Design a protein around this ligand. Structure first.
Ligand SMILES: CC(C)n1cc(-c2cc(-c3ccc(CN4CCOCC4)cc3)cnc2N)nn1
Length: 258
């Protein structure tokens, strides 16, 4: 349980992509996280680009035979997932703060031409001051390079978080897909429940939303101001969907909260 100066003291995450260990340096006592895996070339390359307070820092990597070691910022708060009370959510002001921090993260990624592709509470970690960090770049990819956008075609992510275009279109724009998933995260924070299994015309809950039946759950647990924002985010047509610059002008986004 040791790689060079570091001891691998306990497990933080398991199986998802290899496993995540708490790494404590026996000399310096500094603690980091280490992702251990038995594609990784791409992930490492994207990881080396990331420099922002709401993105997980990459420290470096060591290959030791079969096993790759990715040293990363430790987020000792654990995940957003664990702060969401099932069926309840969390207090609206804590949700708003996390949403602000999530948008700052996403703007940053998009600005360097990176799309995360699997935004959800498991991948949103918290430092010891409750600062949000976007983690896990194993599905991340370049969508803008030398100022030219490339459309995506791989279907990936997590179904309850994916945008509907990803199930219907041969190719689609990256940015509105990440925006959509941020809106399902906002729903989850505010209601402690996901609104649908997947955003397909065969999913009854998704049909209900498109028919504006917001007297059903989870929408009826959400105040009208954040709900008005969720109406602009979870819009089926990605070219009509709100963009982040416009999210930042929204009334609830700018509402002062406890
Ligand atoms: C997304 C993937 C899962 N991952 C996780 C991490 C990561 C995870 C943690 C972390 C994970 C869990 C806890 C607390 N637990 C113990 C395991 O029972 C769930 C709660 C605390 C920190 C800290 N720092 C990271 N950098 N980095 N990448």
């Amino acid at each position: 349980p040791f790689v060079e100066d570091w001891d691998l003291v306990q497990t933080l995450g398991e199986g998802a992509y290899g496993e995540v260990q708490l790494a404590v340096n026996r000399v310096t006592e500094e603690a980091v996280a280490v992702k251990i895996v038995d594609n990784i070339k791409k992930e490492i390359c994207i990881l080396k680009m990331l420099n922002h307070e709401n993105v997980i820092k990459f420290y470096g990597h060591r290959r030791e035979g079969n096993i790759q070691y990715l040293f990363m910022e430790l987020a000792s708060g654990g995940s957003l997932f664990d702060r969401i009370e099932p069926d309840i959510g969390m207090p609206e002001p804590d949700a708003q703060r996390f949403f602000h921090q999530l948008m700052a993260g996403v703007v940053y990624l998009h600005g360097i031409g990176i799309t995360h592709r699997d935004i959800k509470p498991h991948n949103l970690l918290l430092d010891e001051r409750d600062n949000l960090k976007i983690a896990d770049y194993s599905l991340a990819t370049v969508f803008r390079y030398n100022n030219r956008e490339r459309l995506l075609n791989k279907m990936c992510g997590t179904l309850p978080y994916v945008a509907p275009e990803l199930l219907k279109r041969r190719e689609f724009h990256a940015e509105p897909v990440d925006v959509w998933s941020c809106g399902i995260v906002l729903t989850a924070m505010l209601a402690g429940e996901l609104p649908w299994d997947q955003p397909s015309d065969s999913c009854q809950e998704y049909s209900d939303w498109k028919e504006k039946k917001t007297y059903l759950n989870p929408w009826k647990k959400i105040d009208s101001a954040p709900l008005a924002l969720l109406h602009k985010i979870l819009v089926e047509n990605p070219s009509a969907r709100i963009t982040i610059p416009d999210i930042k002008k929204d009334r609830w986004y700018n509402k002062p909260l406890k």
